[model samples]
Target: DLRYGGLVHDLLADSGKATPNSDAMEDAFGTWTYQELLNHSQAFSAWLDGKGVARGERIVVQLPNIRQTVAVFYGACRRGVVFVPLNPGMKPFHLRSVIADADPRLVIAEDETAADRLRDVTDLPVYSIDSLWADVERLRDAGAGAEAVEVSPEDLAVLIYTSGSTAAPKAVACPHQQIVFAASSINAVLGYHAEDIVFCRMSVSWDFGLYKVLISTLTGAKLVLAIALVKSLRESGATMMPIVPSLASMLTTLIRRDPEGAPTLRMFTNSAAALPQVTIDALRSAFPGAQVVRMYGQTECKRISIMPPHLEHERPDSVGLPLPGTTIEILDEDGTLLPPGEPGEITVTGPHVMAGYWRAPEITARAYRRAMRLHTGDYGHLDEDGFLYFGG
Candidate 1:
């Protein structure tokens, strides 16, 4: 069972009306309000309904960091329709391979440039971004509200393809339940407030990147979303940042060249990969007064462990203790549990663990087998004092 989780409705409960939920997103097109965002998502869902899209039908989406992308994501979720986010930069052959593998019911391309990549999706009805909103307006005029589509937390929400570190790319199915746990966990761990302005750096196809977009709106946090790195860091100075270690190294170099000229940078944290000691020290040099956290986890299970600000100096190489209400076990190759100080796979069991991989039951059964546990492939160990260390 989920432990103290909040859905999107719960997160957005305080938004709208007198609150500062006016702005949805920012770009060359300017900012849109939260109400406007809601309208777009709802209208988009109505449009999908008009097209007779089934509740669980897959809708492939490939768009950049813009208002339309966000609308498509939330709208699809609200309607209980599955959204498969594709990389806009994919070539025609790659698109064909994805189509053959995922077999989506429909495809929503960003524009002519992006839509042209999906010539192999001839069997499915595909629509571009420009025409999508027009359809939404038409459906709205016909009295079709987005509420027409109902979604449950257990419903499959998104199918994201991993870039494939080991083998061919595979898709991971993310449900609303996992999204709530991850977002709420981050909020609780970091004490994220609506006042904080977070700069999102990772690509949307990645878990870290996608969560920033979904969680920002859900928790009423301000996302300083940007596509360009130089421009993003320029305008995102000193409030909030989610940096991977490699990029943080660059920021460190910049700050070292001129420490005094650094922006009022605040909370700086790392994810996407294990952070190195050198990167952490650089982060310290860049933002000594700010919080520097190191997180460890994979796409299927976000944040198996984390080293928060309180223990920054206390445990340098350790991934912090299991999150609140979370339990971690070290299992040997034979599957028997290992005691503390012994290195083994860091198997975790928690609410945040995903339901399964997209259309791959066999693997899902192996990974998420136990009733209340998930077998994470990461190797790590816990100390007598309760701190966890990585297995080398």
Candidate 2:
């Protein structure tokens, strides 16, 4: 029996609803439909097979937010390969450190210079965007093996690296089940429908950015990429948008200056950090029609709680309740659950929690407690009604 695991299956199933000419994604260069995306992704998968990439092996990628990045990510999922994406803006020092821990069989880079730098350090195969596409075209013409491979829920699909502010970055090992569950949980809260057009301006290296691709694909919405050009959000008729605090501030300013504001925007989801009350107010005023959603979480769990848009005016301080199928508990230093209004470490227990830190059993053991619950180092308190108030 075919199993539900990676994004390939989800994407293919979603593609059934789209017309041949319907746009699946659009960037600065061009646009493509579900059929065209599936076609290129299949070819890319064949190209990876030609390179001898084994199942469950790592495929490290350092590229900008582009259509090619999306193609490669889904292609890797089809091959049952673990994708480790890195920010293209990352310095060489950080890149080298990540590479050492990743130990990838192949690396996909944006340019020859980036590839050469990695090539000089290791004997591993590295391909630039131009070179990889050239080879992918050849493989497609040659009718190489591009069939989707089966994977289990326990199979590792992605390794999202945490920014190493304290030390070298550590990867959050996410199995197919965890990722799929997290996506569904978040989607359920966001109420993403097929009619929505998602806008993603963040880099794919970050979990938030990567999930935009996943969530949009799962929801069967047209994803408008604005990494290359900032104006794409308005031009593409985006209905849903994900933004960080900084971006939120900038967007609010732009809308204030331009009377038209974001005409097509209907929802604004903010995370990565708490949004200041003034900024939140500005966003609400700027996009009067859009519902501003405040969220809290780390890369380890993808999301913890999201403040409902309707309650934004009433409970501005709270980050909302725990997502469906997820629980949030405040634990004191003694590892005991704290009472309401008492501050303690925020811990998450759910199917959405990550498997563990990649290849770091000791660290993983420290972060995870009994029942595999993740103890987020963050501090917070729960209200009587179960609203999470960020204390740290």
Candidate 3:
């Protein structure tokens, strides 16, 4: 079953109560405790109201990977406003398309340069990033606090764009139900506890890094956005960190150069392009006591399957079992199910599967069945025991 308080914001509230004083999020600049985050999120909801941002109105957030990103996320959740995250590094070539496609109430950027860039694309008013919390404090001083609103499970929550996504500007639609479900299933397997410090290198712009905010808050863990990998991990005493192939290579190099700086970790996860056998081996040799979990998934479902730590090397080629409560099937060209060990289109069915491509009805229809099933375009097969062996 999903965690209580159905929507994504509920999980933030859950953690706030469970560990009010625990660290919630950290970046090169600062950290926000659970209580502070909770207070900030509530105030942001009121700030949204003060701006006259209506329910379902979208806020395009283009900020760095900082605590403010996470605060806006939960704040929007409380206000029933759709959260649209954009990496500041996105060039105007693509950013213009996004502005036209993902029409919004306004855009919030880290500073004037960031806001000026958006101005070059469209006339939408750009708000300062600091105003997110700055005005909230002003509201508090004026004796006002934001009140949470009612939202349906099917209400749109997050609309996230992929790399070079400006072409179709294909934005993946993540509803409140899907986002919450995805976070719950992922944390159930990752087992991120309150004591674990999640050293995250991926920025909040990507779904890979964005979900860390959800999973970390779900279990009351600390999320350090990251600075220097090895040094940050050692200094923060990080126990868990998620990586992609690129970061994995960089990490191996860093750790080898300064072996003494290596932080004792419990688990390391790889969810992007599958790692080479050599990289996997190096990780294990480097952290002999840690679980080098290899996972396979896309932003569509947030995650598909995770290879648990206990099965560390049992099936080196396998991507482990389907996430709890998810169903993975191999489908032939005729849209029929193929038997185990036979490769076919990897199709997924789960609460975690995203709603579909934003504002692109035809494309969405081809990719997802509103009732169920997300055709993951990748080719892969499942073993007799249900382990997914990806062919991509």
Candidate 4:
């Protein structure tokens, strides 16, 4: 039941130090203090308030990873609006389907030109962040304070449509409390700190990207916005990053092309796809000082297990141990738990697990119950050391 019961209250209470703390947001937008981010977000919310938006509503957010996107997120959160993030590169047909599914109060597009196109397809209100920044700035000019919005930990903060192998996507309603806990737990276990410069490498529309962005704000870490991670490598003094194995491989190519100017990154993580031994060797050699970690999870679950850098050499084939406060079990098709070294469907149950699929009770019930645990649909086995190794 991790939902946002009182979002604005928690944020305001956390903002005790009234000083501007420098933290990098998006590319070209160098640094913003904590106070600056709060004020900017509130102002943006005020601007949206002027647009006749109400509480407990839904808004589709389609934007790139930039400063404006961050502002829009907090703005929507403060005003009690459930944020529905759409990939900027989403197809027209897919976009229309999601819009029809959620039927949000407003559809905020990043491009002003797309406004007419969007309106032509859907009757939902449309606002362009590119064009609306002026008014957002105007609100800042007037000044605004942190007014807490009472949110429950289980209140849906976002509706993410997962694109699996199937043609149709499933909408997963994620509560605010779960997201906060996921980010905070990740920050704590991984030792994310204010001194760290975190690289933003995932697509803004995806959960990995959202985690990086949210973790930076909540943990007070500097977020190095990277449009092209390769180019940004030259400019980044980042301590860590949460990226897919594909991107990590691309970095390997770049490092091969030019070795001396390569970044001194602190840690390297691989997800999205299992790490190939070639890629693993490349990462280990390329980042001699950095830790090589293999993480396992999906959009349905926050994060099940991870092989931290310290344990990289120990569990080369395994994804490592369950996160703190999380429990993992291997179960048979008949909902029976399996013993260690036995492969079965991976079932997880914990506070970090999402409630269920939004509006799909049948799927939710079935998906959540597997041997009386939350079924992950992923197959895995546990070694003698309790390390979980995912299977095909």
- The C-alpha lDDT values of all candidates are 0.70, 0.80, 0.83, 0.72
- The RMSD of every model to the true structure, in order and in angstroms, is 3.0, 2.8, 1.8, 2.8
Winner on TM-score between 1 and 2 is 2
Question: Which candidate number would show the highest lDDT if scored against the true structure?
Answer: 3
Model 4 regions lying over 4 Å from their true place: 1-19, 164-166, 227-231, 370-372
What's the TM-score of every candidate structure?
0.89, 0.93, 0.95, 0.91
Q: Write the per-residue lDDT of candidate 1 for residues 151-170, one digit (tens) a residue.
A: 67777777878644344556
Stretches of candidate 2 exceeding 4 Å from the true structure: 1-9, 16-21, 141-146, 227-231
Q: Give model 1's TM-score versus the native structure.
A: 0.89
Residue pairs with clashing backbones, model 3: none
lDDT of 3 by residue, 1-392 (tens): 45533698888888888899999898989888998888888877788888898888899988888887887888898878999898877888788898777899988898877888888987888988875567887765664544667887788889988648436688888889888888888788878888889988888878888888888988899999962567777778889988888887887777887777564677889887878888887877777777889888887788899988788888888888888878999999998999998999999998888888888889888888644898989998998899999773
The Cα error of candidate 3 at residue 190, in Å, is 1.4
Clashes of each: 5, 0, 0, 13
Report the Cα lDDT for candidate 1: 0.70
- Among residues 3 or more apart in sequence or in different chains, the pairs in candidate 1 whose N, CA or C atoms overlap within 3 Å are 22-33, 24-32, 238-264, 238-265, 238-266
Lowest summed lDDT across 10 adjacent residues in model 1 is found at 1-10
| Candidate 2 similarity to native, TM-score | 0.93
Q: What residue runs in model 3 are displaced by over 4 Å at the alpha carbon? A: 140-143, 163-166
Candidate 2 achieves a global lDDT of 0.80
